[model samples]
Target: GSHMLDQQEESLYLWIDAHQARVLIGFEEDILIVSEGKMAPFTHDFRKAQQRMPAIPVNIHSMNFTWQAAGQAEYFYEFLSLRSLDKGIMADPTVNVPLLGTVPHKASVVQVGFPCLGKQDGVAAFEVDVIVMNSEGNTILQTPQNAIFFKTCLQAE
Candidate 1:
């Protein structure tokens, strides 16, 4: 004759298997405590916008982007230096300077906005690269090359 295990016993066995044996051993001695570290949370946002106004009779383009790095002070300078590097590369005659901006340390998000002439009956294309670096000045995250293309036409009245 055999007895069936209750829900509590089944759950305990599953929990023991999910966690490492080392962790379970520590918990047995009542000496283990878990806490979320003070590490900073990082995020980056970028956008591009284009508009055509009747008053101006020309195309207007604007973009607003920002990065947020929490719980880290050096992150500000890291981002600034990275932006400078990007600007330098764009300054080269062979490279088309993509607009870049940054805001550091402050809780508020940083934004970059600009206006340019809009084109009709043509295609607009742009390439963007995003890179994230750690305090050690090493690239931790590099996004794949991204490109955007759009075509527009004017309506006849």
Candidate 2:
């Protein structure tokens, strides 16, 4: 399960071994930690999110709606509520520069709230954001740290 904190701010420390198999990817305010560095395969629960998220090294810019990267189109999992990332955080969703209009959601534009899943093919580039509150027209979910911004990254050489 997941836990929530009500406090405004706090510091989290890590205990690592000399091997340093830890992979900490900080997205916006939350830091997603992978690789517990065990004798066998890593844990499943903590690593699943890391699998869906792209690794953004420093110096990379926002991966704003790039092409070729594989992502499920909106309504792919809609109605069924199968879209886990599309929760309140990434409630707004899209695929590519999409078509939007006034309606039930009242979205004037197109975008996605959370970082959609991406599969890295051979010799291809994928630029994507992991968590975004202002993907389409949901500014209410925006955070103070980096509003309307997401970490971008390169996949292959």
Candidate 3:
């Protein structure tokens, strides 16, 4: 996402320098496809990676969207278990919007992740579904029926 590397290299691995928001060691997990108004902050679905530590929460600095809302207007993200029979989840992580310098102009999209919010690893999973709340504290967007980017590579002999 910078002069460091392009999208293809990220598919293989994301290199972290001395600075990072969240750091980890892992391989590819799954990706969130945000092409058709379903994804953002990145082009290639964040290049999701499976972590070395399970049940650990990480962050996604996905996209930056310009909003004409108030400074306190909130834009946030949530995750849903695709494996859930009914996708039962009571509460979401939190709602926050980053500022454009000294003022909060654009509603930034940053998300949090957990291998399993509170379940056994490899038994549970989550895919990002975004929601938004305005300065009036009204739920503006509730998109549950979303999609993801799950890919695989195989070797045959």
Candidate 4:
């Protein structure tokens, strides 16, 4: 009576591992232990500061500008050589000799507080004293260490 229906399902088993005895196999989520030689693949995280500031110059003798933060007062200065090296011994590829009135500092963020003005035959030894202060004469920054100085040299092109 039911013989006809059984024959229909029997044909499907023909593709089931043809002629091999019934076998048992199993699988599931798992992990394998790797050898002790420094884990093949490693994990790492790195970080970097993404901000704007005075960039370092390659020629050493150049001008650079810096600031405390956004919407804050700004300042600029030239790269100064050490006492051992004089202006005459240094060479500047860029020449920017500002005339007396060329640079005006009236209510301007850029200003040379106390500039040294004069002329000498050759590069002479000169020292400088820098002070960062407020309107009330309160010291903000100073030399010898805390602050960095930028110096510039003029070429007679």
Candidate 5:
């Protein structure tokens, strides 16, 4: 939210960078929208690309972001889903997922966690869309990176 990137350093750390990221939120209603720079695609792993690794439990934890406004905001909710096309073999991967929304003080930060959310079989990478809304169900701000991309790496517990 409030950090600058080291160009050459992160050049080796991103997949694709996104822009105009936004979150729509409203007062007492639900959520709605509105609309970066230094777009950097985060680097990722290649193991999942092989597609032959054994399937194990991979749990996604949470979402994090900073409130970039000058005032406080509430009902900050995040809508998330995984985008995949497996020839109709898999059901629609869309889930409102959680963050239960929250309230952020000006220039503050927050992290929301997920429960029982993980990939059954790991893939090289996955694409996702995150829609953020305010209480009025209106979109408000957009993250620095407007898009979401994930690369899976197996870490032992």
Candidate 6:
């Protein structure tokens, strides 16, 4: 991850710097795809089959990015689980989780990873929105949304 590497190269200078057990997960560059269609023929169908499942609770990790100035950046970390429920909607919906606090500057490389604890009946998704703001928290950046979907192992009995 360029973000993670950038932080390490400048600050740590050592290949392996063990500050603590901080799990770094990396997400790909945000991409957007737009499609226009009048309608669709026939009935579109989506289906799935039941299978063996794992009983472990899946973990979710989130990272928020913000820039203080042109080149200065910051990050906020939070740990989440699938069992959590969604709250009200905003420009970006906030999920309930334990926040690990914010980091002052960018790391040489920042990597975000998810280790599934188990599987469940349905799918899970993630949404991200980029917003630009002025000093007074004015709206600058427009709405650009991204989503990622995945299924868990299975629900426990």
Candidate 5 segments whose C-alpha is farther than 4 A from its true place: 1-65, 82-97, 106-123, 141-146, 152-157
For 1-157, candidate 2 gives per-residue lDDT tens digits of: 3468453321211111211122223323223221111112222322334432333332322222211112221111111121233222222233434232111111122223334233332211222222122235442211121112222322333
Please state the error at residue 49 of candidate 6 in Å.
20
lDDT of each: 0.25, 0.25, 0.29, 0.23, 0.32, 0.27
How many steric overlaps are in each model, in order? 1, 1, 3, 6, 35, 24
Best by TM-score: 1
Task: Give candidate 2's whole-model lDDT.
Answer: 0.25
Candidate numbers sorted by TM-score from highest down: 1, 5, 6, 3, 4, 2
True-structure lDDT of candidate 5: 0.32
Looking at model 2, report the run of 10 residues with the lowest lDDT sum.
73-82
2 or 5, greater by TM-score: 5
Summing lDDT over every window of 10 consecutive residues in candidate 1, give the lowest-scoring window: 9-18
- Give per-residue CA lDDT, model 3, range 1-157, as digits (tens): 4797544311111111212223432333333332222334442323334232222232332212222223442333233322222122211233233311111234333333222133222222334444444345455444444323221112212
- List model 4 lDDT by residue over 35-120, tens digit each: 11111221111011111111112233332221221122222222232222244434222223221111112222222221212222
Could you tell me how far off, in angstroms, the CA of residue 64 lies in candidate 6 after the best superposition? 8.9
Summarize candidate 5's per-residue lDDT along 1-157 as a digit string, tens digits: 3468533211101111111121111111111112111322321222232121111123423333343322333435464545433321221333333434543333333343223223343333333444455667786533333233332324232
Which pairs of residues collide in candidate 3? 34-39, 41-62, 41-63
Per-prediction RMSD in angstroms?
20.7, 17.6, 13.8, 32.4, 14.3, 14.0
**Cα TM-score of candidate 2:** 0.17
Candidate 6, residue 149: the lDDT equals 25
Task: For candidate 3, give the lDDT.
Answer: 0.29
Name the TM-score of candidate 6: 0.30
Stretches off by above 4 angstroms in model 3 are: 1-111, 115-124, 147-157
TM-score for each model? 0.35, 0.17, 0.27, 0.23, 0.32, 0.30
lDDT of 1 by residue, 1-157 (tens): 4478533211000001212222323322111111111212211111233221111111322222333443433231222221211121121111112333222343332222222223232333334344444556565444333222122222222
Indicate whether candidate 1 or candidate 5 has the larger TM-score.
1
